[model samples]
Target: SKKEKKKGPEKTDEYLLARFKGDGVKYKAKLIGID
Candidate 1:
């Protein structure tokens, strides 16, 4: 359960990229903490 929770954010980001166009840049900014 702990491991699964840790992976949740990553999976959510991947899912977002797949579902939302132009989200790849947004996601990358998120990783860099650029808001």
Candidate 2:
């Protein structure tokens, strides 16, 4: 018996409430990468 031979994966980089100052304005974003 096999529950799941293949599984999903995620390449989360810099994945968080990233805070950055740009144009003298407060901003935040979440970045991720996958193939």
Candidate 3:
């Protein structure tokens, strides 16, 4: 028999933290008021 799978997915805190860490350059541009 096959098991049913969950459809929706979510992001974890660590995933978001890592994502933000990788996106720091974008924030730096805002910090210096660059467009």
Candidate 4:
């Protein structure tokens, strides 16, 4: 198997990014840093 990508993500941005997009309860845990 082989894995490769043209572009990837780092961190921190996930908070705001995922926070901005998710399901119920939302990204409160992610964005807020808790469950």
How would you encode candidate 1's per-residue C-alpha lDDT over 1-35 as one tens digit per residue?
53555533556655875756666676677887974
Rank candidates by lDDT, best first: 3, 1, 4, 2
- Residues 1-35 of candidate 4: C-alpha lDDT, one tens digit per residue: 36664445544554565545645246555776874
Q: Give per-residue CA lDDT, model 3, range 1-35, as digits (tens).
A: 46664544455565656667678678766987987
- Candidate topping lDDT: 3
Model 2 superposed RMSD (Cα): 12.3
Backbone clashes under 3 angstroms, per model? 0, 0, 0, 0
Ranked by TM-score, top first: 3, 1, 4, 2
- After superposition, the stretches of candidate 4 with alpha carbons farther than 4 Å from their true spots are 1-7, 13-15, 23-35
What is the Cα-based lDDT of residue 16 in candidate 4?
60
Candidate 2: tens digits of C-alpha lDDT, residues 1-35: 67765554343355322323342232222333322
Cα error, candidate 4, residue 29 (Å): 6.6
Q: Model-by-model lDDT, in order?
A: 0.63, 0.35, 0.66, 0.54
Estimate the TM-score for candidate 3.
0.31
Look at candidate 1 and tell me the lDDT of residue 33: 91
How well does candidate 1 score on lDDT at residue 21? Answer: 69
> What are the models' TM-scores?
0.27, 0.12, 0.31, 0.21
User: Clashing residue pairs in candidate 3, if any?
Assistant: none
In terms of lDDT, the poorest run of 10 residues in model 1 is 1-10
